[PDB]
Design a protein around this ligand. Sequence first.
Ligand code: ZN
Lengths: 96, 292, 49, 1126, 49, 88
Amino acid sequence: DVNFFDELRIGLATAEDIRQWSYGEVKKPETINYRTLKPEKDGLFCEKIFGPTRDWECYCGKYKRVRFKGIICERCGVEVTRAKVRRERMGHIELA
Amino acid sequence: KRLKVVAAFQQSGNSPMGMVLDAVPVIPPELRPMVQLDGGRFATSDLNDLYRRVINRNNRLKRLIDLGAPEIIVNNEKRMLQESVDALFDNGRRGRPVTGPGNRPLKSLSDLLKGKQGRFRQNLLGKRVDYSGRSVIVVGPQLKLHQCGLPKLMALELFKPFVMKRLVDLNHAQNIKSAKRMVERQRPQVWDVLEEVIAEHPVLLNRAPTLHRLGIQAFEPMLVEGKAIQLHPLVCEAFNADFDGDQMAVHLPLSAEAQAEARILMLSSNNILSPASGRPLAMPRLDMVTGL
Amino acid sequence: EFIPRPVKSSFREGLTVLEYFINTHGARKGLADTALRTADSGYLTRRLV
Amino acid sequence: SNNSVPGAPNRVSFAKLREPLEVPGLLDVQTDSFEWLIGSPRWRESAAERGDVNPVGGLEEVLYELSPIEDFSGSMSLSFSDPRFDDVKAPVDECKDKDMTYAAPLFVTAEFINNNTGEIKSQTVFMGDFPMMTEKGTFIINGTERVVVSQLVRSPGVYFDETIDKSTDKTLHSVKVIPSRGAWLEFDVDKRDTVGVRIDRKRRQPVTVLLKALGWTSEQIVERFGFSEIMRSTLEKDNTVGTDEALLDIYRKLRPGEPPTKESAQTLLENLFFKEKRYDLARVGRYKVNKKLGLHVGEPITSSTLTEEDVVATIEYLVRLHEGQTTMTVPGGVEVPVETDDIDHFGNRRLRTVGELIQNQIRVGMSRMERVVRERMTTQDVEAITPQTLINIRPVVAAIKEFFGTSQLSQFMDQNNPLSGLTHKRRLSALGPGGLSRERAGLEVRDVHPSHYGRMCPIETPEGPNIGLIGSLSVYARVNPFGFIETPYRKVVDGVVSDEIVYLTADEEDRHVVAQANSPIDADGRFVEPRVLVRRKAGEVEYVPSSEVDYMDVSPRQMVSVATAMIPFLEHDDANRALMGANMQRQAVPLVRSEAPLVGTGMELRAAIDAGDVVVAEESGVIEEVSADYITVMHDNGTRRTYRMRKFARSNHGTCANQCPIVDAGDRVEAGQVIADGPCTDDGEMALGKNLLVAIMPWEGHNYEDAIILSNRLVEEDVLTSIHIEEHEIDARDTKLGAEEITRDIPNISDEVLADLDERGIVRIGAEVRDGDILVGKVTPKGETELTPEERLLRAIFGEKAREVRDTSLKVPHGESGKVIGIRVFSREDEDELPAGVNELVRVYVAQKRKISDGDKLAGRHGNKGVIGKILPVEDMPFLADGTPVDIILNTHGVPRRMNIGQILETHLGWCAHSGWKVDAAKGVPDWAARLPDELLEAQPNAIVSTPVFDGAQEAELQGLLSCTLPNRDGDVLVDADGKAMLFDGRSGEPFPYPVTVGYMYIMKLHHLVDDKIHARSTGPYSMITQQPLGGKAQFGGQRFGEMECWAMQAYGAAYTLQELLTIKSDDTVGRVKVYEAIVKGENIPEPGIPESFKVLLKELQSLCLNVEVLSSDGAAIELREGEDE
Amino acid sequence: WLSAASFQETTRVLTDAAINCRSDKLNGLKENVIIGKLIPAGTGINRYR
Amino acid sequence: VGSTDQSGTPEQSTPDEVNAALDRLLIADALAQLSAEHRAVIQRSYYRGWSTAQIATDLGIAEGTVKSRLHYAVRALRLTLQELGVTR
DNA sequence: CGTGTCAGTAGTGTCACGGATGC
DNA sequence: GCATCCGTGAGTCGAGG
RNA sequence: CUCGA
Ligand SMILES: [Zn+2]
């Protein structure tokens, strides 16, 4: 990632661009569970949308090892990469 | 002024429809983190309460649309969804802001970029830096104009990785791992090694407010006992520094280019004149002029 | 504006109670406005930058 | 003699003026306010002799205002009476230790009155644990001493303003009616010669719209306001007319969105301003209106409400003021002048202390319960109801908990030295709720007001952003039950000074003229000069006939604070350095041993006793047993009272609070006498520093502009050595994978680091610990799925299984070192109530013995501050003729600039006290010592003296004392009559070419030591969000290269240093690690990458519906190790 | 627009920037300071670099 | 109860990677002194986190061959680390 | 699961200056 | 056509809560 | 919030 790129362009974000960024819709208004500290599905911290809480650890707990790198879990819908993606994966709310 | 707005949408090729949103983006969670407290409870960013209020009212609107509720409830609901997204993007812009617990205005997304506390001025124009320190300044008459006296304990932590490198070269430490434990424990060998490290390696001294460029000057470090920074009496005019409790910051240039910029461009002995007027600054000023 | 009555005593002689009290008026507001004048100064400075 | 009332040491005062009134209780502001709140017997007896008939405490006042509670019908009634307290729950020190709150249970008597059944059930209802104020004037919330600060607020009443318009340049006028509670009401005359009114911030209606809504006909309005043409233009330009029309006009602007009924507006326009439910002018607010308007000025204060007559008289007051009128009488009212009010005048600016600030929070909590009462009445049956069932004390105790827990007035107590604590309790703060915002305070609220004379100090105030907003109460000042500050004066009958003393408020002081304290007075009382310096209303000082003086000041120091009154020769120091002197006296550090100053003012005694950090005898008696642990006093009646000493206790700010007994076994001690003194105290006087031998001369540049040179004797003899104590704390919790346990068994740690630990993993008492040493050994279980690939390989290549726990022990922070003096362990296993989720808590107290070091900040009493630049050996110091070396070398250049000649005069008098003097008695008393008391004509070495503020020693007497200084043991006089002495250069041996001013000065060690203020960081923690280094020394963070510092880099052209600072040395996630590797490898510094903070900025602009993209030279958008899916 | 949004009126500049769809050529002291490039001044110009 | 924007709440911090970087450097040095077989087996068991049979399938070798190579290479790294003074 | 005798704001002392907003 | 009102801005660094 | 230059 070199440090020479000429222009930085800004423009209006189409409602279709918002969906192009979003890794899923934030349906429920909940955040997490106040016992297990696990975020509720489709919430504001959903791991299916934004990313895993811990590195290579899914929500349902089936995939916790590094050997399953890049697998989309079928039972909880969470990808298995590092938690660094929770700083860059965007969500979106679809308005009625 | 109307053409100024319309012509931009005409030439650019982007539709003005973007000003009306059908979907709102959600910032990633780590930029709006929710931390746990030592009392068992939690604490989340205000952006989460704004996103949560948009979600709450948008789902209620979906219920009213499904139920065929009277148009007065649906319209009064759609108004609140407008105010919620308006609060998420810029709370307080229109009308009275959405108060949190304790009548405190919630911080919107645009509040992350505004003013002195915004992202630009707080985290982009100025940053906190590694390899730096601060201590009280003390006058040092014996020092030469290109020299400054900094405490030994400051230099050890400031030059910690360099000290660990030389501790493993001279075989005072087996590996770099134990060399780190030796610097943390301050084994007596490091004081003989640290003297070799800081040799002709310039440092930067700074006293806020940094009014002009001479508010930061380069010096040759000299290991002195005590815990205060020893400053030359002639650079006191440039820093506007009296000795009634002032503190200065020290910054260590790492790269070869950075040390060269301090050795040539920022050295105190190479900046005797004021860049604003051309008349000298490092001159006898108080006790010295009376003595002469 | 200047008070129609001056502080005749010197600090070597010793100001009176009322002389000291009227002196603190200008001394406090002298320190008070220095913070605002430096704020507008640094604001003009960063505009010039 | 000075202060011959408690049995204190005999300090001899240079006093020419007698003290008519002795200093009041310096803790009365915090004490009396709380005694009234809880209705203590002392307050009731004080009010009894005050002339009060049936006085009512703050709690009784809240219960009477609340009682009774009734529903819409009146069939159910609840009432409260007889508030009382049981004994305190736990002692003061037990609350400090166990981190609970000092409180006593509050009992009341409640009863249910049923009109429809004719029977009443009365009982006692516990209200809540009520926070109690200690004898020192402080509260204890969760084991921390706090101080409720008195607040300066705008007094209730009607106030007028003369504003100047911006566009038309005509003089406008405005009125404000500020109630003690409820909605606001402001009338004004705009620039169009029309009168309007804003009701509760709402829209500005014409002033006749309000008159028509109250039932006033359009004819009676012309009858009342006919003499002005600006009111005729108001009723004419009016839009709507009709009693039932403007009443709905007000309803639709005040409560929009509701159907307007003639009686729904008739109900609120009575409840918002004339029913005691939603509106109330306090007894002071009603009285301030009855004086400002000149009506009911004779009637007993019974109306606790605004009336319609007041509204009309207010509009009458405004319309007359607008067109230049200066006098008005309300129809049926006394004459009153027509003018604008200051709102900064201390007669219109009110001070509410501890009792009122708590009472208001109790009132709000009671109102929240009252709504619960009315709701619980109409739900439950009307025959099984008891006072216990209607009362839910949850919002009440949570209201007082919300106050003491979070408030700008409930402040963490200043505990640097006893003076800082006493000053903090006497602080008057304008900031806070009901006062003003810091952003909403101009240069007029902060500066000195002429009414502050003798009430608030014009010197003691911070010089930061809180200047003027925070003041200290004057010495003799006090607060009346209204809220205004009273100050005592000597009533002058007919140009004759009388010993009769009366306290006057601010406006009461303006209705007279007062003479300055230092007025020449006959022994009978008549003024020597016909014309004397006299203060008049609006801050006018001028001469005036002796038959015009009504009152005069009590003491010269009447205008200054306690700390300001402690600066000797204050009249010779400018207000700037005097402010710094009083502010830095509160910053003194309690030394190991304390020395009282040779040059004093007399205030040090009462300041130390009233501070509450000494131990005074309550009753007279003899000492039965004395130990370093406690003192036992055998009273005359036969009882024994034992006072326990507070030994080596940590203060709020890490200073050492240590009390030491003074008396011995079998010493007769009177009541109110100091039997033991604590920090910064010597024989009962404030000892904020030491007496040091000072020479005023430049010395080889080591004292260059405000730098200080010290003798190494101060290090060898612990003269400026102080004790400091730090508190370290850690807890063992329940985690997701188990529970944190405190154990000596720590993975991969030798038996040598753990050698100072006991069998539990705790450091043992007495062990000396440097930085990095382990204090409490705690391990936390970490999951297997949380391991680094290298860490799991490193675990395999060492064969150490079952190490699923990591090290989270409590280590000593950087810059800390000392002896472990105490341990406190709290365990859930042992009935100790910890927060939910905690299993063990350990607190370790570490004490360091800090000698004076290079860079430690010293200062005097005259704002002369400086850091220690060099500590030479004792032989290097310039020494006098008899070999005694000086202790401190002060630079001469930093003396005539600051205008603080008091330090020079203190140095002269300081030597005369050190040596002593003998005035020539032969051939009469000399002409310079005629004014001096006879006690001053002879002095012994190391004598103590007092220089009262604006009184004390004059330069004529000080010059005469230098001429007759006592000789040393050899018989030689070292200092000359000029005050200078001949010194020898200890480095070469040759005597210095000229004599140098040498004497003794009182130097204080301020709490600004390099041991705390030194900091450095290679790497360390980073803020999780911005990925930039942390801030503050405690967080082991780095310095901030700010915006101005980047301008300096660019001005130099140092591009690479600037790129290095903003990238690899800050928030480059991969650059900083590869730099650290390049340094330990000896390689070159790599190329800086992209700041993570800039990545966050882009991801934030995306969340604001902004499509930001980075383009290359060709134009293609480039991503940042990320993509996008849908 | 990046050098302006960091000076004053952040929202007022960002609104007109997205409407006009302005593209910023990252060639300036304030811009390179933000993104981490060598400032085009002093030792940063192509002549000495 | 709390808001991070509100004052009085400690900001989240992340410790420095100094200890991890030094361990990674020492692991890389001891890795260079290993045979290509042993190095390409520990880098497939701990760096890639595969199973014993997964590495056996990839390298085309036996199951016990991967067990034995891992068993020795681990002790070979312990030899190099203890020869350089790495703390147990 | 359902709810029902009236049931009524918080908070209130910056200011200079320019230009879009509005009668 | 112009007076009103809204929105913008108001030094830097450091320490303990 | 409070203080240091
Ligand atoms: Zn899963």
